[PDB]
Amino acid sequence: EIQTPDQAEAFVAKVFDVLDSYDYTRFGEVLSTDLKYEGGLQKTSGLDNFINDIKASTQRMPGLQTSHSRYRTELTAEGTIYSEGHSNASLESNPGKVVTVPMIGVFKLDSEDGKIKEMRIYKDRLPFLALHQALPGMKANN
Amino acid sequence: EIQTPDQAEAFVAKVFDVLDSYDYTRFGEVLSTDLKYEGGLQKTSGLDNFINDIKASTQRMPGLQTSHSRYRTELTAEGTIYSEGHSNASLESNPGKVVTVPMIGVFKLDSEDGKIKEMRIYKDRLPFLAL
Numbered sequence A: 001e002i003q004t005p006d007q008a009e010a011f012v013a014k015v016f017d018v019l020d021s022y023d024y025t026r027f028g029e030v031l032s033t034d035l036k037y038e039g040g041l042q043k044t045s046g047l048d049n050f051i052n053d054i055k056a057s058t059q060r061m062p063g064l065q066t067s068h069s070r071y072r073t074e075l076t077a078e079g080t081i082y083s084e085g086h087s088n089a090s091l092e093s094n095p096g097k098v099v100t101v102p103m104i105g106v107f108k109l110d111s112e113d114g115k116i117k118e119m120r121i122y123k124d125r126l127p128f129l130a131l132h133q134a135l136p137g138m139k140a141n142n
Numbered sequence B: 001e002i003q004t005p006d007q008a009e010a011f012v013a014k015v016f017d018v019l020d021s022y023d024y025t026r027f028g029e030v031l032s033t034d035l036k037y038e039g040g041l042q043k044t045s046g047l048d049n050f051i052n053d054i055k056a057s058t059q060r061m062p063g064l065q066t067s068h069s070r071y072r073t074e075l076t077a078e079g080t081i082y083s084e085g086h087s088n089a090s091l092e093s094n095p096g097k098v099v100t101v102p103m104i105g106v107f108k109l110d111s112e113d114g115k116i117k118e119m120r121i122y123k124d125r126l127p128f129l130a131l
């Protein structure tokens, strides 16, 4: 059970380690099957609907690779985790180009099994339009 | 001064009412002179630099009209305000076309005067390309 900001931050890091793998068979390890997700105008109910929202993104961005870091997390008396950090993304065909923006995640956990029941992620997606398909092994950025 | 989350939420609403006026002569009513602001890739230190960055960012959006609403606010033991809500924008030339996105603001206050000394606003700006 998460009781300190550091434990909450470590759990957020574990969550994004799963999400950033795109191994959908592992998402239920950390996300409730009744997950309520919001990321901007993207809004889903249920883990399968969440996964189908992400798969569609990996098609807008072939070879998408992502990572997250954290620097400031609070765990509140209401049980909410607020975790501020950064979101990094590239396309595998040109890994020397990385887009990084600040982000914050708001999380609520299931009281029984500790999985994420509500996840609201806020960041600016406009800079990610700078990601672009390239030929792997062929220079694509000045 | 602020002691409850409902009071924190009312203050954030008042702050956005000032910001959404674009009347920079009033920004110091609620923002500290040494404001540290981040909004995605926008990042400023000092109230003068915040004003100048908003002024510059909006110069290519003549007729911009914005408003904000609040949904869910917490006030933590250490005084952080986390306020989730929505940001609405339209242009005076076409006021019926409104773009609304979720947002959250993270705020820390100056203990001496209760003004905002740190303000970090998170939201997706991509939908605003439609304006």
Ligand SMILES: CC(C)C1=C[C@H]2C[C@]3(C=O)[C@@H]4CC[C@@H](C)[C@H]4C[C@@]2(C)[C@]13C(=O)O
Pocket (backbone or CB within 6 Å): B019, B039, B042, B054, B057, B058, B066, B087, B089, B121, B125, B128
């Ligand atoms: C449309 C968008 C680019 C914007 C115009 C104005 C209004 C805005 C919208 O919420 C913000 C609300 C608070 C203040 C930082 C505003 C600055 C903008 C540049 C803002 C932003 O930085 O998001």
